[PDB]
Design a binder for this molecule. Structure first.
Ligand SMILES: CCCCCCCCCCCCO[C@@H]1O[C@H](CO)[C@@H](O[C@H]2O[C@H](CO)[C@@H](O)[C@H](O)[C@H]2O)[C@H](O)[C@H]1O
Ligand SMILES: CCCCCCCCCCCCO[C@@H]1O[C@H](CO)[C@@H](O[C@H]2O[C@H](CO)[C@@H](O)[C@H](O)[C@H]2O)[C@H](O)[C@H]1O
Ligand SMILES: OC[C@H]1O[C@H](O[C@H]2[C@H](O)[C@@H](O)[C@@H](O)O[C@@H]2CO)[C@H](O)[C@@H](O)[C@@H]1O
Ligand SMILES: [Rb+]
Lengths: 232, 121, 221, 232
């Protein structure tokens, strides 16, 4: 149930911030699926079932955020203005990226569909695939991911700033410090794509290849940033 | 009679409970005293008179006692020595001789009333 | 919140075998707030209401401190009028009680008299300096007033050091609320003759001897 | 976590009124964002990202109301008919002003966009900008703001009326009294614009300038009303 055996969970009682938060997460994953049109005919029914792969990817992504949220509020049981503020920023980012994720997930499902050879349907429905549009694709979703992890870092730092008020022990202080580092390291990868895309060194698709390729090397690049700080 | 000198802001009652278990296992009396200005009463009394058997104070005052010849050299076996952190033993060393037994590290902190002040300076 | 809605509440409660309000009618200190609510025309209004309560069989004729207290603590009456001192006996009983603002009469508030519990030294005493020691160094201290207060509550203590503790008590808040709506009694030598005049007046009108108009006539003299 | 150290929080346990209320607040902020159309093409995606500034302003506004709600129910733990009634009136006002806020936020974002020089897109999409319409804009949103603060004042007054039942101490009584004054003072500013607009002294845009200008002088005008009552 819990992550650490040395952590004393201050947020076992459910609060308004957590209840409100659960409503928003449930609404996000629910409206992602149920924002679709109701099938009126067999043809619509089969079309609607092609959407499950894109939705599975979106849902998986949202619960992962929900989990991090659950663990934070479980650890610290925080309920102050600044926690409320940072919490709102988080849910706000989530909300604005629900329908854009539905889009990205459908787009990438067609691209990966073409590769593997499952389907051969058109991508002209998405509009023109231009350099500017493919760059804005990275910058958009990259800015989204960066923000979510950035906010999680700020939230843990707020708990670190209230370590004494929360009566955090040496183990708990260490966890909190490690959780900040983790979230900043997570945020760094989308920050690096975003910056590379915005400068655009090549002036062509090469930029987008590199930017996209940093996510495939998430684990190794995270280890490099972590190793640089430990080596000094 | 085993006499111990420790400051009144410390846990002399608890130190006595250890002393009471000692008398049960040996037969020696362990009285615990806490006189005012013991840091500057010890080097005057212990030099001339009898004073205490064992003196408790922060390590900083012990070099002066060691130079003056007011303290016996500590000779603890490896197994006892190994029970304590090696950095702690360094604090109780004067001219390559162990002059005391390290007990605990002490540092001042900011103690605050959470009700009157939730987010202190 | 109003005195005038008690008869309705009493009709409701008497059906369920309970009284609405029981308080000491014998001592005029308890009846004075209702009498002095408006004010004379104010005394005539306030007392006539009190007379109508006994006339409508809502309140008993000879309601005293003991049968009122006992009835409230037993759980027979829904309300009572009393001071800080009475709280401890309620706590002893298993009654979830509340202390609040006295009911309003003719819109305006019921003005209860305010007393300052005070300790005086007898002029014909040889222990004047020993009593001063007791009063100053032992009683009028944080520790001293605490001891008295845990037995039977003193109310709003005169000690400056006790402000935080007083302010944390909801019953004290209600006491101070009523004290502001009331007024401090003058200490004058005529207070004795005054109180006696009111004590008789209220008893006579309650029992059914003298009229409300004739009560204020004899009392003003 | 708490506002006052002298306040004893009667509403630490979550109740149905609070749970229901959290659902409504979550739904309001969620449907504000997710009431938009799902992007089907890159062009829609970029259009949808122009909506984040208007949404941030709306969201910020709604959580501020949610916070006041959280603090009230935390303070008093109330659950009676009259509290339910006033609570419903509040949520009702919120709900009817969700989509109108989306509108106002988009409109003002274009106006402020033009000023700063970020964009130069048309305002003809909003319809004709006439004196009657710009007056109704003030009266509408002014009536909304007035009501929310009016209801918060009524809610605190209901708690004040039940001070004895709630076992409120001298500090808590003072807080409650101060919270009533605060909410009435907050309500006064939209009440003053609304009245000025409804009378319409100038018979032209000048009316709307003044009405709008009272919100920019919120803090100072609130201090004037507060100072008038203290001076006597
Ligand atoms: C890997 C294999 C899977 C590839 C799946 C690709 C899905 O691609 C996506 O399909 C759905 C089919 O409903 C289309 O969606 C369309 O139909 C749904 C049916 O309810 C409507 O809600 C929506 O208005 C319309 O856009 C998307 O516009 C298309 O982008
Ligand atoms: C300050 C700089 C920011 C200025 C932002 C101004 C936004 O202005 C607002 O943009 C969005 C763009 O989606 C338009 O919104 C339009 O597209 C959205 C896209 O999902 C549809 O949901 C909606 O049907 C349609 O109205 C609004 O009608 C326009 O008023
Ligand atoms: O009843 C008239 C009587 O009232 C006041 O006495 C109060 C006293 O102050 C209280 O402490 C309480 O014990 O009850 C008394 C009345 O029962 C006046 O102080 C007193 O002069 C007057 O006789
Ligand atoms: Rb819909």
């Amino acid at each position: 149930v819990g992550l650490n055996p040395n952590f004393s969970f201050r947020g076992k009682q459910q609060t308004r911030i957590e209840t409100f938060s659960d409503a928003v997460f449930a609404l996000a994953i629910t409206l992602l699926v149920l924002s679709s049109t109701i099938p009126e005919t067999f043809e619509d029914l089969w079309a609607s079932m092609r959407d499950v792969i894109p939705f599975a990817i979106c849902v998986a992504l949202i619960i992962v955020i929900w989990y991090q949220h659950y663990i934070f509020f479980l650890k610290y049981g925080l309920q102050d203005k600044v926690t409320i503020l940072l919490n709102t920023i988080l849910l706000f980012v989530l909300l604005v990226y629900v329908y854009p994720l539905k889009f990205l997930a459908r787009f990438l499902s067609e691209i990966y569909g073409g590769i593997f050879g499952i389907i051969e349907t058109d991508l002209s429905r998405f509009g023109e695939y231009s350099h500017q549009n493919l760059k804005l694709l990275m910058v958009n979703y990259g800015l989204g991911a960066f923000a979510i992890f950035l906010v999680f870092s700020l939230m843990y730092w707020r708990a670190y700033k209230m370590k004494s008020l929360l009566d955090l022990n040496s183990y708990e202080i260490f966890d909190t410090k490690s959780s900040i580092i983790a979230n900043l390291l997570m945020c760094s990868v989308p920050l690096l794509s975003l910056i590379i895309t915005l400068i655009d060194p090549w002036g062509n698709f090469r930029t987008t290849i590199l930017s996209g390729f940093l996510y495939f090397l998430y684990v190794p690049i995270m280890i490099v940033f972590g190793r640089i700080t430990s080596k000094k | 009679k085993l006499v111990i000198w420790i400051n009144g802001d410390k846990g002399y009652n608890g130190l006595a409970e250890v002393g009471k278990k000692f008398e049960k296992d040996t037969g020696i009396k362990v009285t615990v005293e806490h006189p005012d200005k013991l840091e500057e009463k010890f080097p005057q009394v212990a030099a001339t008179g009898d004073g205490p058997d064992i003196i408790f104070w922060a390590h900083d005052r012990f070099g002066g006692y060691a130079q003056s010849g007011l303290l016996a050299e500590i000779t603890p076996d490896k197994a006892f020595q190994d029970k304590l952190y090696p950095f702690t033993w360094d604090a109780v060393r004067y001219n390559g001789k162990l002059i005391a037994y390290p007990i605990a590290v002490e540092a001042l902190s900011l103690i605050y009333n959470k009700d009157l002040l939730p987010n202190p300076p | 919140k109003t005195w005038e809605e008690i008869p309705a509440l009493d009709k409701e409660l008497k059906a369920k075998g309970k009284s609405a309000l029981m308080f000491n009618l014998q001592e005029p200190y308890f009846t004075w707030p209702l009498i002095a609510a408006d004010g004379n025309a104010g005394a005539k209004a306030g007392l006539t209401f009190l007379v109508d309560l006994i006339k409508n069989k809502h309140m008993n004729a000879d309601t005293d401190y003991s049968i009122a207290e006992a009835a409230f603590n037993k759980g027979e009456t829904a309300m009572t009028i009393n001071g800080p001192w009475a709280w401890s006996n309620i706590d002893t009983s298993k009654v979830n009680y509340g202390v609040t603002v006295l009911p309003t009469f003719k819109g305006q508030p019921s003005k209860p008299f305010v007393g300052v519990l005070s300790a005086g030294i007898n002029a014909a005493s040889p222990n004047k300096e020993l009593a001063k020691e007791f009063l100053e160094n032992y009683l009028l201290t944080d520790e001293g007033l605490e001891a008295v207060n845990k037995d039977k509550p003193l109310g709003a203590v005169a000690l400056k050091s006790y402000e935080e503790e007083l302010a944390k008590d909801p019953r004290i808040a209600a006491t101070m609320e009523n004290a502001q709506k009331g007024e401090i009694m003058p200490n004058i030598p005529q207070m004795s003759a005054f109180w006696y005049a009111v004590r008789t007046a209220v008893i006579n009108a309650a029992s059914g001897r003298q009229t409300v108009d004739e009560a204020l006539k004899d009392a003003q003299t």
